[PDB]
Short mmCIF file of C-alpha atoms in Angstrom, two decimals:
data_model
loop_
_atom_site.label_atom_id
_atom_site.label_comp_id
_atom_site.label_asym_id
_atom_site.label_seq_id
_atom_site.Cartn_x
_atom_site.Cartn_y
_atom_site.Cartn_z
CA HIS A 3 -23.23 11.52 -24.74
CA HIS A 4 -24.78 13.14 -21.66
CA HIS A 5 -22.17 15.82 -21.00
CA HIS A 6 -20.04 18.54 -22.54
CA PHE A 7 -16.40 18.00 -23.44
CA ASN A 8 -14.57 21.08 -22.16
CA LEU A 9 -11.45 19.58 -20.55
CA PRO A 10 -9.17 21.14 -17.90
CA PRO A 11 -5.49 22.00 -18.59
CA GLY A 12 -2.72 20.19 -16.74
CA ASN A 13 -1.81 16.53 -16.83
CA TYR A 14 -1.43 13.40 -14.72
CA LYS A 15 2.36 13.33 -14.48
CA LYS A 16 2.35 13.94 -10.74
CA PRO A 17 -0.06 13.16 -7.84
CA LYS A 18 -2.39 15.95 -6.72
CA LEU A 19 -4.59 17.20 -3.90
CA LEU A 20 -8.22 17.78 -4.94
CA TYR A 21 -9.23 21.01 -3.16
CA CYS A 22 -12.96 21.81 -2.80
CA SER A 23 -13.68 25.52 -2.35
CA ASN A 24 -17.21 24.86 -1.02
CA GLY A 25 -15.88 24.32 2.48
CA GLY A 26 -12.17 24.40 1.79
CA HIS A 27 -11.50 20.65 2.12
CA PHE A 28 -9.15 18.23 0.41
CA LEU A 29 -10.77 15.01 -0.85
CA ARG A 30 -9.68 12.12 1.35
CA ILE A 31 -9.84 8.33 1.00
CA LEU A 32 -9.38 6.64 4.39
CA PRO A 33 -7.75 3.17 4.68
CA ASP A 34 -11.09 1.65 5.62
CA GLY A 35 -12.65 2.77 2.34
CA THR A 36 -14.44 5.76 3.86
CA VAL A 37 -14.40 8.95 1.77
CA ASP A 38 -14.65 12.52 3.13
CA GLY A 39 -12.79 15.82 3.25
CA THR A 40 -10.22 17.37 5.57
CA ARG A 41 -8.59 20.78 5.91
CA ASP A 42 -5.36 19.24 7.22
CA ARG A 43 -2.78 19.50 4.43
CA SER A 44 -0.47 17.12 6.27
CA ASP A 45 -3.02 14.30 6.05
CA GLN A 46 -1.50 11.22 4.39
CA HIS A 47 -4.69 10.06 2.65
CA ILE A 48 -5.36 13.18 0.55
CA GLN A 49 -2.58 12.53 -1.97
CA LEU A 50 -4.23 11.23 -5.12
CA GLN A 51 -2.86 9.95 -8.41
CA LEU A 52 -5.06 10.50 -11.46
CA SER A 53 -4.65 8.62 -14.74
CA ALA A 54 -6.49 8.63 -18.01
CA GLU A 55 -8.23 5.53 -19.31
CA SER A 56 -9.53 7.47 -22.33
CA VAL A 57 -9.45 11.18 -23.10
CA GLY A 58 -11.39 12.89 -20.32
CA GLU A 59 -11.94 9.60 -18.46
CA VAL A 60 -9.94 9.07 -15.28
CA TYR A 61 -9.25 6.91 -12.27
CA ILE A 62 -8.68 8.79 -9.02
CA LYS A 63 -6.41 6.70 -6.78
CA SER A 64 -5.09 7.08 -3.22
CA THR A 65 -1.29 6.97 -3.47
CA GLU A 66 -1.13 5.94 0.19
CA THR A 67 -3.56 3.00 0.12
CA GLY A 68 -3.92 2.26 -3.59
CA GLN A 69 -7.72 2.44 -3.36
CA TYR A 70 -9.76 3.83 -6.25
CA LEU A 71 -12.41 6.52 -5.73
CA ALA A 72 -15.76 5.05 -6.71
CA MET A 73 -19.47 5.75 -6.38
CA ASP A 74 -21.87 2.94 -5.58
CA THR A 75 -25.36 2.13 -6.89
CA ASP A 76 -26.93 4.35 -4.19
CA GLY A 77 -24.63 7.27 -4.94
CA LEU A 78 -22.19 6.89 -2.04
CA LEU A 79 -18.46 7.40 -2.63
CA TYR A 80 -16.20 4.59 -1.44
CA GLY A 81 -12.60 3.41 -1.82
CA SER A 82 -12.43 0.31 -4.04
CA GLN A 83 -9.49 -2.08 -3.81
CA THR A 84 -9.80 -2.91 -7.49
CA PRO A 85 -10.78 -0.85 -10.57
CA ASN A 86 -14.37 -1.45 -11.69
CA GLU A 87 -16.95 0.50 -13.69
CA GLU A 88 -17.90 2.58 -10.64
CA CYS A 89 -14.31 3.92 -10.58
CA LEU A 90 -14.41 5.74 -13.93
CA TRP A 91 -14.88 9.53 -13.78
CA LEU A 92 -15.51 12.10 -16.53
CA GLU A 93 -13.03 14.88 -15.71
CA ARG A 94 -14.23 18.22 -17.05
CA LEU A 95 -13.46 21.92 -16.86
CA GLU A 96 -16.27 23.87 -15.15
CA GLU A 97 -16.99 27.63 -14.91
CA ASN A 98 -13.91 28.02 -17.15
CA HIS A 99 -11.62 27.20 -14.23
CA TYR A 100 -12.34 24.29 -11.91
CA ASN A 101 -12.34 20.51 -12.36
CA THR A 102 -15.56 18.49 -11.90
CA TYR A 103 -15.83 14.68 -11.83
CA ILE A 104 -18.99 12.99 -13.08
CA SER A 105 -19.59 9.27 -12.56
CA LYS A 106 -19.27 7.54 -15.93
CA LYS A 107 -21.44 4.65 -14.72
CA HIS A 108 -24.22 7.03 -13.68
CA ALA A 109 -23.52 9.73 -16.24
CA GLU A 110 -27.15 10.06 -17.31
CA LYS A 111 -28.11 10.83 -13.69
CA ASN A 112 -25.56 13.65 -13.34
CA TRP A 113 -23.88 12.29 -10.20
CA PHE A 114 -20.72 14.21 -9.27
CA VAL A 115 -17.94 13.87 -6.72
CA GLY A 116 -18.81 16.58 -4.21
CA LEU A 117 -17.95 17.83 -0.72
CA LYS A 118 -20.30 19.71 1.62
CA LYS A 119 -19.20 22.72 3.69
CA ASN A 120 -18.81 20.48 6.78
CA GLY A 121 -16.42 18.19 4.95
CA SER A 122 -18.84 15.32 4.30
CA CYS A 123 -19.19 13.79 0.84
CA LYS A 124 -22.41 14.35 -1.07
CA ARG A 125 -24.48 11.39 -2.22
CA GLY A 126 -24.84 11.23 -6.00
CA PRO A 127 -28.52 12.27 -6.29
CA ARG A 128 -27.86 15.35 -4.12
CA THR A 129 -25.26 16.76 -6.47
CA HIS A 130 -25.97 18.67 -9.66
CA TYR A 131 -24.57 21.18 -12.14
CA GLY A 132 -24.30 24.64 -10.68
CA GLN A 133 -23.27 23.73 -7.15
CA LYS A 134 -20.12 24.87 -5.40
CA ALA A 135 -19.75 21.39 -3.82
CA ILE A 136 -18.71 19.80 -7.14
CA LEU A 137 -15.95 22.32 -7.96
CA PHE A 138 -12.37 21.18 -7.38
CA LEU A 139 -8.89 22.56 -7.97
CA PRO A 140 -6.01 20.12 -8.37
CA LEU A 141 -3.08 21.28 -6.24
CA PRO A 142 0.51 19.97 -6.14
CA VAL A 143 1.36 17.63 -3.28
#
């Protein structure tokens, strides 16, 4: 029990774009497993399908490639071909508005999904509560 339990509204019925206000990028999972952000709304690897494994626990999956968003042992995000413990995220409401995603595996370390202003992903240890990089807004595809 390392984190709060304020959950965001909305559901998982339809796929979404995960928009990061920090630099104004959409989370993207490239076919080769690379993860980053892009401002191009037409990109075909920014469409993501979320699903709940337990209340507040989700998988974030590329609808285009089927890969699951995951964070490795050194805090780097990667696209996994199969669902494993590094693919589970704690989806929470933040600043009474946005969605944040904390690694369940590394929950005690407070590692979040996060995008820098230049569109590069943040490594787990470099993220933390209070940053703009960890704030996302789910937008319709």
